[PDB]
Amino acid sequence: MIVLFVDFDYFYAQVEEVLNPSLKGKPVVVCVFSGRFEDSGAVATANYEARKFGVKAGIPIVEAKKILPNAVYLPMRKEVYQQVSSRIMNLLREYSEKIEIASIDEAYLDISDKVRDYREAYNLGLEIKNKILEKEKITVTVGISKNKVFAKIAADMAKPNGIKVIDDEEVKRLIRELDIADVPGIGNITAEKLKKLGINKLVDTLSIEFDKLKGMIGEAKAKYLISLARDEYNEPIRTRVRKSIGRIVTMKRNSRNLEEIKPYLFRAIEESYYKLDKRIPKAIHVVAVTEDLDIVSRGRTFPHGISKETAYSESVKLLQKILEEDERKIRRIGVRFSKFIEAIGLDK
DNA sequence: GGGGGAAGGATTC
DNA sequence: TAGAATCCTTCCCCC
Ligand SMILES: Nc1ncnc2c1ncn2[C@H]1CC[C@@H](COP(=O)(O)OP(=O)(O)OP(=O)(O)O)O1
Ligand SMILES: [Ca+2]
Ligand SMILES: [Ca+2]
């Protein structure tokens, strides 16, 4: 198998640059303004000019401005980025029918039927980069290898505006030398659980007792890492199906008052129904974010689709259930719909 | 901030 | 070698 992974560079900020070329060269910071107070909210993403100085996805807007007070701060326009994204994804389908859209700015292509070696792979990766730049004026990074995991790793090492092949030999090298923290699916919590077991590299997973590894990180991640370390990871390129659609809104103040919470919960419903488009959910979950930023969830599955009116009445009953079973104050409130009428995937 | 999947407990066959 | 499928909420990751 030969996988070609495409990752659009600093995507949201780059789209803003395309729509407003005067922004080119300047630090651009795309933000999610929460509405609590002035510049409350977080950075969604920043271009490389901003990131260079430490302004990155996840930091408070307040903190970003301390670092770069003169950067351009823009509100996230997801609808806009989604349309640009859709156009680029359509362009990629012209290079392979075996395509996996992993997110708004990431897609895997199985080009095993298209190319014979990694030299032609690299060439095809150049063609794709060139095509996206000419049609949309978007630069991307291409990662190429024998599977999805290493194709992603290649892109991670080569971004931005890059292209990298990790051949069979380099795959073996990385198994020995790559910090296991840099493997997709291993976040800070898993990395620390692993380090306490003495696993720092993929190769280390093969010598540790399996039940020790499993007990610590779960059977799934254990098997996953071992399959990688054995150079036997194979996961096919498959069409991802949206399984849930929702919205969580931040309230003006923390609250356990049903009447004060209701309007926010109802706005989340309205937005969520808009997003659903033609999808009809059979399941609804109310999701509360507590004052200490914990997450509490209660849901219901119906043997039928949920009308907006049923969503309204059920959501209150579910929020009442949360209020009863958790004494903490609620900071954010929202709703998530799933179990869509009519096929495989499409719900949870 | 949205959203997917696995962990782990409970249920039921 | 081994309860195991399934449903539910929490946990963890990532984009
Ligand atoms: N707190 C948050 N709020 C909203 N969206 C967030 C977020 N944290 C992350 N995201 C989302 C929004 C953007 C994305 C950030 O992840 P990458 O850095 O992988 O994507 P890109 O921006 O293209 O940078 P490049 O790929 O060139 O490194 O995740
Ligand atoms: Ca990207
Ligand atoms: Ca990591």
CB A187 under 7 Å to nucleic chain C: yes
Q: Where are the domains of chain A?
A: 2-10+78-166, 11-77, 167-233, 244-336
Long-range contacts of A224-233 (CB under 8 A, 24+ apart): A224/A185, A225/A180, A225/A183, A225/A186, A228/A149, A228/A175, A228/A183, A228/A202, A229/A175, A229/A202, A229/A203, A229/A204, A229/A205, A230/A206, A231/A171, A231/A172, A231/A175, A233/A147, A233/A149
Q: Is A271 a catalytic residue?
A: no
Question: What resolution does the deposited structure have, in angstroms?
Answer: 2.0
**A102-to-A85, A96, A105, A327 alpha-carbon distances in Å:** 12, 15, 8, 38
The answer for residues whose C-beta is within 8 angstroms of residue A211's C-beta and 6 or more apart is none
3-state secondary structure string, chain A? CCEEEEEECCHHHHHHHHHCHHHCCCCEEEEEECCCCCCCEEEEEECHHHHCCCCCCCCEHHHHHHHCCCCEEEECCHHHHHHHHHHHHHHHCCCCCCEEEEECCEEEEECCCCCCCHHHHHHHHHHHHHHHHHHHCCCEEEEEECCHHHHHHHHHHHCCCCEEECCHHHHHHHHHHCEHHHCCCCCHHHHHHHHCCCCCEHHHHHCCCHHHHHHHHCHHHHHHHHHHHCCCCCCCCCCCCCCEEEEEEEEEEEECCHHHHHHHHHHHHHHHHHHHCCCCEEEEEEEEEECCCCEEEEEEECCCCCCHHHHHHHHHHHHHHHHHHCCCCEEEEEEEEEEECCCCCCCC
Q: Are strands A244-255 and A106-110 parallel, antiparallel or unpaired?
A: unpaired
The answer to whether A249 and A264 have CB atoms below 8 angstroms apart is yes
Q: In ligand 1, which atom is closest to the CA atom of A11?
A: 23
A105 is in an annotated binding site: yes
Rounded to whole angstroms, how far apart are CA atoms A204 and A197? 10
Method: X-ray
What dihedral do alpha carbons A3, A8, A10, A16 form, nearest 10°?
A: -170
- For strand C, which residues in window 241-270 of chain A come within 7 Å by CB? none
CA distance A245 to A269: 10
A167-233 is classed CATH 3.90.1150.10: no
Q: Which of residues 17-56 of A touch strand B (CB under 7 A)?
A: 32, 34, 42
Class of A2-10+78-166 per CATH?
alpha beta
Same-fold call for A11-77 versus A244-336: no
Pick the CATH number of A244-336 from 2.40.50.140, 3.10.129.10, 3.30.1490.100, 1.10.3720.10: 3.30.1490.100
Q: Which fold has domain A11-77?
A: MutS, DNA mismatch repair protein, domain I (3.40.1170)
Find out whether A9 is annotated in a ligand binding site: no
Residue A329's identity, in one-letter code, is K
